[model samples]
Target: QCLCVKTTSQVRPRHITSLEVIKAGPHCPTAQLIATLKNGRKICLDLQAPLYKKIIKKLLES
Candidate 1:
């Protein structure tokens, strides 16, 4: 099942402590990006956003 019911294109890059990339699959047809903030709140990010790509690249490389 998809974890995100809603998503946003904007977020504070500095406040993101961690990132989770959920690939598209049978359970979830669309890929999902989950960002864990400094305050420990989880937020879904829009996959089409340019910032999303940057964040994912950083997460994967780290």
Candidate 2:
């Protein structure tokens, strides 16, 4: 199932207080991604990406 977030909403645990790196590198438990949004601004998000290889999709509306 997909979780649809509202434009006014943010990533889980709003106001990221801290980030603990569990693992490292491509085989780590998290994936780091840097993307340029539609507004031409670069935003970085961890997709649990390299940690888990799969399709990732996100949408923003405001």
Candidate 3:
């Protein structure tokens, strides 16, 4: 099942411990970006956000 039904455009990168990208598939119609915080909390990120664009760029570069 898709973990994200909605997403936000703002998040503090410093608090993010890890990130995962879920490509669109049978479970969902759109891509999903999941961020795990230091405390083990997860949040969905808006792909259209500029900050997230930079983050995704770095992910691809690495």
Task: Summarize candidate 1's per-residue lDDT along 1-62 as a digit string, tens digits.
Answer: 89887998678876787988888999998988899988999999987767887776666676
Name the regions of candidate 2 deviating beyond 4 angstroms: 1-31, 50-62
Report how far off residue 40 is in candidate 2 (Å): 0.5
lDDT score of residue 1 within candidate 1: 84
Off by over 4 Å in 1: 57-62
Models sorted by TM-score, best on top: 1, 3, 2
Candidate 3's C-alpha runs over 4 A off are 56-62
* TM-score of each predicted structure versus truth: 0.79, 0.28, 0.75
Q: Which number leads on lDDT?
A: 1
lDDT per residue (tens digit) for residues 1-62 in model 2: 11211122124322333333233355543434444344444334545543212212222211
TM-score of 3: 0.75
Which one wins by lDDT: 1 or 3? 1
Best by TM-score: 1
lDDT of 1 at 17: 79
Q: Write down the lDDT that model 2 would get.
A: 0.33
lDDT per model vs. reference: 0.84, 0.33, 0.80
Which pairs of residues clash in candidate 2, taking residues 3 or more apart in a chain or in different chains?
31-49
